[PDB]
Amino acid sequence: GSSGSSGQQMQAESGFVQHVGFKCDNCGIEPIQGVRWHCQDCPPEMSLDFCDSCSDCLHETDIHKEDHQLEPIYRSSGPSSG
Ligand SMILES: [Zn+2]
Ligand SMILES: [Zn+2]
Numbered sequence: 001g002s003s004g005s006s007g008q009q010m011q012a013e014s015g016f017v018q019h020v021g022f023k024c025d026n027c028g029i030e031p032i033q034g035v036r037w038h039c040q041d042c043p044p045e046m047s048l049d050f051c052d053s054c055s056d057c058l059h060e061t062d063i064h065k066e067d068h069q070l071e072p073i074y075r076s077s078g079p080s081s082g
Pocket of ligand 1: 024025026027028029050051053054
């Protein structure tokens with residue numbers, strides 16, 4: 001059991017992961033804060049991303065479908081050069 005909500009203010013700050021570039025393909029929230037649900041079924045090119053809010057939502061597109069699965073991405077993992 002888990003569920004959280006928030007508006008649009010002082011969001012980008014010590015509290016939740018701020019994913020830049022990734023936008024929710026459900027509501028349209030970008031950047032995506034918190035956990036970024038990245039589809040697993042979809043290809044690496046047509047990879048989708050849903051916000052924790054739209055994590056329990058169902059979206060079906062040309063490629064994406066309801067059967068497809070989603071991966072809860074808490075923190076963003078990259079090269080972190082430097
Ligand atoms: Zn959303
Ligand atoms: Zn998919």
